[PDB]
Nucleic acid binder design. Structure first.
Lengths: 57, 55
DNA sequence: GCTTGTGTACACAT
DNA sequence: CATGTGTACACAAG
């Protein structure tokens, strides 16, 4: 997975979002603070959906 | 789900990432482009256990 | 005194 | 009437 720092992430956000749209999952990191992932709403919405059909307790 | 446009996301990204860390899922929209979602890595990693449909 | 994060603002493009 | 995208400045935090 691609991993880019905040400063770089923002300074290139368009290129990041373009990369994301191409199917790449990009990790956003910040000093100390917990990381995040930018992923296409479609993919992630379809992850959430497939997870919701798990016969577990 | 919270939904912000690109210009606002780039200009408030720190506040966006703080919101996400608090458990929020944030939709980023772009003109004529498919939307993206910024989500906590922990949550995302857990949601990819959806890849237990592929199996 | 670096690096990186955060606010912000300007200019051009769509 | 706005939003996307490059970029650059300055201050804060580490």
């Amino acid at each position: 997975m691609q991993s880019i720092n905040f400063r770089t992430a923002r300074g290139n956000l368009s290129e990041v979002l373009n990369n994301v749209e191409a199917g790449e999952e990009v990790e956003i990191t910040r000093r100390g603070r917990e990381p995040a992932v930018i992923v296409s709403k479609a993919t992630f919405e379809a992850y959430k959906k497939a997870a919701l059909d798990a016969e577990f307790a």
